[PDB]
Amino acid sequence: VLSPADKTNVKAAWGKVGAHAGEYGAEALERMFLSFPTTKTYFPHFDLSHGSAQVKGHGKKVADALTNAVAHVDDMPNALSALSDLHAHKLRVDPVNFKLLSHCLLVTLAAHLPAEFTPAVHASLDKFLASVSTVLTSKYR
Amino acid sequence: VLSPADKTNVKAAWGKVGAHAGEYGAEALERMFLSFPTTKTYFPHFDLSHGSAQVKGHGKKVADALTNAVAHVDDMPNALSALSDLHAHKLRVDPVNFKLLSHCLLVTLAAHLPAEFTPAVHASLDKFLASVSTVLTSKYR
Amino acid sequence: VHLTPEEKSAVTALWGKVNVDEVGGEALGRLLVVYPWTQRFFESFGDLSTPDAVMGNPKVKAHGKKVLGAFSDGLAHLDNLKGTFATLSELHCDKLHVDPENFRLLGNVLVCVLAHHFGKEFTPPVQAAYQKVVAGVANALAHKYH
Amino acid sequence: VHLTPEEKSAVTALWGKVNVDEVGGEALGRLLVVYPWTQRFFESFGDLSTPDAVMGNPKVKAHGKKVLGAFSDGLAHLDNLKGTFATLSELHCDKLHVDPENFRLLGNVLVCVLAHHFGKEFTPPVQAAYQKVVAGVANALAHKYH
Ligand code: HEM
Ligand code: HEM
Ligand code: HEM
Numbered sequence: 160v161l162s163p164a165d166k167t168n169v170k171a172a173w174g175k176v177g178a179h180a181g182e183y184g185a186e187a188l189e190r191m192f193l194s195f196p197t198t199k200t201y202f203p204h205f206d207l208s209h210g211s212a213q214v215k216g217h218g219k220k221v222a223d224a225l226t227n228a229v230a231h232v233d234d235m236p237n238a239l240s241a242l243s244d245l246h247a248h249k250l251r252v253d254p255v256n257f258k259l260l261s262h263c264l265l266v267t268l269a270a271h272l273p274a275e276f277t278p279a280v281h282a283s284l285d286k287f288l289a290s291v292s293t294v295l296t297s298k299y300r
Numbered sequence: 301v302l303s304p305a306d307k308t309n310v311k312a313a314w315g316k317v318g319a320h321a322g323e324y325g326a327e328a329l330e331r332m333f334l335s336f337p338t339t340k341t342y343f344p345h346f347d348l349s350h351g352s353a354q355v356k357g358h359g360k361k362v363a364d365a366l367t368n369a370v371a372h373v374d375d376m377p378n379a380l381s382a383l384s385d386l387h388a389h390k391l392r393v394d395p396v397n398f399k400l401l402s403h404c405l406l407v408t409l410a411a412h413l414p415a416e417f418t419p420a421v422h423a424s425l426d427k428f429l430a431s432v433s434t435v436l437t438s439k440y441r
Numbered sequence: 442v443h444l445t446p447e448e449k450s451a452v453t454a455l456w457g458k459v460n461v462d463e464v465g466g467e468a469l470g471r472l473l474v475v476y477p478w479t480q481r482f483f484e485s486f487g488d489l490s491t492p493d494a495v496m497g498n499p500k501v502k503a504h505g506k507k508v509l510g511a512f513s514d515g516l517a518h519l520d521n522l523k524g525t526f527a528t529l530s531e532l533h534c535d536k537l538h539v540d541p542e543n544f545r546l547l548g549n550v551l552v553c554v555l556a557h558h559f560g561k562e563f564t565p566p567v568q569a570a571y572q573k574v575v576a577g578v579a580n581a582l583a584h585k586y587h
Numbered sequence: 588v589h590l591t592p593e594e595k596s597a598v599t600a601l602w603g604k605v606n607v608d609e610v611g612g613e614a615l616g617r618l619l620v621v622y623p624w625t626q627r628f629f630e631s632f633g634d635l636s637t638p639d640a641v642m643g644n645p646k647v648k649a650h651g652k653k654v655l656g657a658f659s660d661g662l663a664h665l666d667n668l669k670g671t672f673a674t675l676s677e678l679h680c681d682k683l684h685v686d687p688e689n690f691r692l693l694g695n696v697l698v699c700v701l702a703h704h705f706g707k708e709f710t711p712p713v714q715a716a717y718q719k720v721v722a723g724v725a726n727a728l729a730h731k732y733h
């Protein structure tokens with residue numbers, strides 16, 4: 160689980176991103192759709208177009224789910240049970256895809272906050288997203 | 301998490317293997333050492349030889365840790381915290397290696413119990429080992 | 442790939458006794474059963490929500506017979522899985538977008554299938570050889586990245 | 588690999604502005620920091636138990652300069668990463684036994700490093716191109732499986 164320092168880093172990053180949460184979430188998705196087109200086959204009836212509003216809207220849902228994860232770092236399995244059901248049972252998302260979105264969340268972060276994206280923070284955010292990703296694919300276990 | 305049926309399958313397999321637990325554990329390791337030699341670099345001062353006694357002895361420790369996992373399917377993160385510390389923090393085991401031992405546990409199982417190793421059981425045992433493996437690499441998160 | 446004369450031998454000796462009509466649909470069926478996300482590539486196959494429905498599915502067995510067909514080619518050109526699977530490599534890599542990780546999965550389920558059938562005959566050294574070939578084949582399928 | 592003229596262009600345009608003295612040790616240092624198990628291949632490097640100790644480690648920067656050196660070769664023979672990295676492919680695959688998965692890891696940390704330095708200039712399309720090359724290179728390193 161996340162150390163006290165890791166918790167502090169993730170929140171610091173969460174506080175600093177603040178209002179841009181939904182936007183960063185839409186960008187990470189656009190980034191994922193473009194770098195790993197295979198991921199698009201999960202959003203068929205979606206306008207995966209650029210300025211897409213459906214993407215803008217899913218970005219926000221993703222960022223909100225993440226904010227919820229941040230508020231239950233020591234609870235997550237619980238707090239995400241529903242989401243874990245959606246993605247694992249009903250959607251059958253290939254677990255590799257979680258590494259790909261997470262990797263894209265980090266690029267987005269890194270690109271908008273070059274100076275704060277130090278190796279330690281990178282490390283803390285990476286552990287966090289992997290905790291989130293592991294909870295979401297937990298219904299396969 | 302494991303369904304009621306999955307729990308029943310794993311225990312059925314645990315009961316049927318019974319006394320052969322430590323042995324199957326040594327075989328899965330011998331199998332892992334031979335198919336993925338890279339794994340051997342984690343047991344330097346070990347006689348990774350065939351009839352090795354150190355291997356016979358580690359097989360038993362592994363099977364016991366698994367039996368402990370079976371008895372805390374809904375607890376594991378807890379029940380394995382120590383083990384998770386050993387393997388993740390002090391040993392720095394590459395997470396891919398857990399997929400490799402688990403894959404070798406299943407071959408061992410399958411080879412000694414051809415007829416009981418049905419697709420459903422295979423499915424249940426796979427979910428179990430992945431739960432175990434995920435708990436053991438959880439200190440990287 | 443590079444196998445010792447002993448491995449190259451055990452592998453063909455083993456293969457020769459493989460029911461090529463069943464072993465492939467079984468490896469494919471177990472893949473789809475055990476790793477449910479892989480069921481997404483075979484939607485035309487029908488309801489795969491139960492293990493028995495997956496294993497008895499005629500399209501799963503038919504298609505599985507081809508997959509085994511491929512591994513058979515490999516054991517026939519171990520030092521050329523590059524070209525042998527070259528065409529396939531494009532199919533899976535360039536047209537399909539299958540994550541190479543899933544190639545690894547299928548290959549290892551095949552090994553488990555082989556262990557399920559030959560029991561104790563599938564000794565550690567023998568398993569060790571197949572992981573080799575299976576590793577080769579998966580590499581070849583991932584080989585073409587155009 | 589196959590990149591559109593636009594990607595092939597954005598990639599070299601980007602690369603040309605890359606501090607080849609630092610970018611490599613940084614990608615390597617972040618890999619070792621972020622995925623601690625990778626520290627096991629570089630024991631001769633010393634105490635890597637803190638991020639600052641890893642990043643400032645002279646051997647990490649030196650060695651990192653070579654890794655970048657390799658990717659540079661790749662961008663110079665995108666349609667030949669097969670032979671270009673052929674030699675390396677043997678080093679990493681045949682002698683070292685690095686799991687191809689770790690090649691994927693390093694390649695993606697490099698992408699994050701590039702994003703860390705070029706900020707908003709590392710646009711989605713631009714990132715998209717590098718994932719392509721990085722995917723190619725990792726494939727080539729895994730290519731040789733002898
Ligand atoms: C960082 C991990 C992820 C988070 C936090 C996340 C978050 C969410 C949220 C908030 C929803 C809405 C659920 C609801 O309204 O009930 C959603 C839906 C969904 N997610 Fe994820 N997700 C993640 C990863 C992924 C990945 C990797 C994919 C696949 C490439 C994916 C595919 C989907 C799909 C297809 C939907 C449904 C879209 C629709 O049809 O409306 N998600 N996700
Ligand atoms: C199925 C997952 C695994 C289980 C249940 C398991 C179980 C155990 C147990 C019971 C011990 C003894 C701990 C103690 O006495 O405090 C141990 C030690 C150890 N394990 Fe694991 N292990 C697993 C996977 C792995 C893997 C994949 C590797 C690496 C390839 C590995 C490497 C080690 C090493 C190097 C030791 C220490 C050996 C020594 O120096 O005495 N384990 N493990
Ligand atoms: C080492 C592993 C693999 C081998 C040897 C293999 C072999 C084959 C072969 C022989 C074909 C038939 C080609 C033809 O009829 O001309 C094929 C098609 C295909 N493979 Fe695989 N394959 C592998 C792994 C996978 C995996 C993991 C997936 C899962 C995503 C996959 C998805 C497909 C699909 C979608 C087709 C066509 C299916 C259809 O006809 O509807 N394959 N494969």
Ligand code: HEM
Pocket residue numbers: 625628629631650653654655656657658675679683685689690692693694724725728
């Ligand atoms: C796309 C990824 C990679 C590239 C492009 C790459 C590149 C290089 C290059 C250029 C060399 C130096 C060869 C020479 O000096 O002749 C090398 C050596 C080496 N690489 Fe990598 N490498 C990659 C990934 C990795 C990963 C993930 C590991 C982690 C296990 C690794 C472990 C090593 C080791 C152990 C050496 C020699 C280290 C030493 O000199 O002590 N490499 N690599």
Ligand SMILES: */[SH]=c1/[nH]nc([C@H]2COc3ccccc3O2)[nH]1
Pocket residue numbers: 399400402403406407426475542545546549550553
């Ligand atoms: S018996 C069985 N079924 N699936 C599997 C494992 C085999 O091990 C393995 C290693 C690397 C990637 C996937 C994978 O699936 N074993």
Ligand SMILES: */[SH]=c1/[nH]nc([C@H]2COc3ccccc3O2)[nH]1
Pocket residue numbers: 258259261262265266285621688691692695696699
């Ligand atoms: S910013 C950063 N650091 N590490 C990583 C991820 C990138 O995504 C990824 C995909 C597949 C395998 C490894 C991996 O490591 N992103």
Ligand SMILES: */[SH]=c1\[nH]nc([C@H]2COc3ccccc3O2)[nH]1
Pocket residue numbers: 533534535538539540541582583584585586687688690691722723725726729
């Ligand atoms: S179909 C295929 N084969 N290789 C690849 C790319 C993408 O993923 C990857 C993962 C690990 C090592 C190398 C690669 O290159 N697509």
Ligand SMILES: */[SH]=c1\[nH]nc([C@H]2COc3ccccc3O2)[nH]1
Pocket residue numbers: 541542544545576577579580583679680681684685686687728729730731732
């Ligand atoms: S160094 C290297 N490159 N490929 C390989 C083998 C082993 O692992 C693997 C994983 C996924 C697809 C194909 C392979 O083949 N070793």
Ligand SMILES: S=c1[nH]nc([C@H]2COc3ccccc3O2)[nH]1
Pocket residue numbers: 257258259261262263265284285286288289395396688692
């Ligand atoms: S192997 C292994 N174990 N954990 C990982 C990485 C790879 O993918 C990620 C991508 C972004 C953040 C965390 C991630 O976990 N790879």
Ligand SMILES: S=c1[nH]nc([C@H]2COc3ccccc3O2)[nH]1
Pocket residue numbers: 254255257258261288289290292293296297299300430
């Ligand atoms: S179940 C199963 N198998 N592999 C996983 C992956 C899912 O996504 C991840 C993403 C980042 C780090 C670790 C992860 O574990 N989950």
Ligand SMILES: S=c1[nH]nc([C@H]2COc3ccccc3O2)[nH]1
Pocket residue numbers: 254255398399400402403404406425426427429430542546
């Ligand atoms: S990708 C992904 N997610 N989960 C897995 C598999 C691969 O390795 C295993 C090997 C044996 C049992 C369970 C396993 O989980 N591969």
Ligand SMILES: S=c1[nH]nc([C@H]2COc3ccccc3O2)[nH]1
Pocket residue numbers: 289395396398399402429430431433434437438440441
């Ligand atoms: S952290 C991290 N990244 N990848 C993992 C792997 C560890 O081993 C596994 C073994 C089987 C199934 C899923 C697994 O998740 N753990």
